[PDB]
Design a protein around this nucleic acid. Sequence first.
RNA 1: ACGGAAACUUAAAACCGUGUUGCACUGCAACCCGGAAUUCUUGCACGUCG
Length: 38
Amino acid sequence: QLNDIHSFIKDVLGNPYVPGSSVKGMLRSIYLQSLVHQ
RNA sequence: ACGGAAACUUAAAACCGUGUUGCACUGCAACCCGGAAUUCUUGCACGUCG
């Protein structure tokens, strides 16, 4: 059946957030990635 | 055979004995080891499922 479950990042109380490093790394996959269009 | 001829001015004896170049006196009074320098800038927990 359903096995053991992974973990998201939380702050100090179980309250989660999207990381700032990933949303900085999100746009690292954008501005170089977009306008290469040999 | 010259008032002539002989003779030491000589022998010993400590310029010694008592006596501090000594007594009173800060190598002391005043000062900062003190002022100006980002532990920083590049960095996604993810590729992987008959």
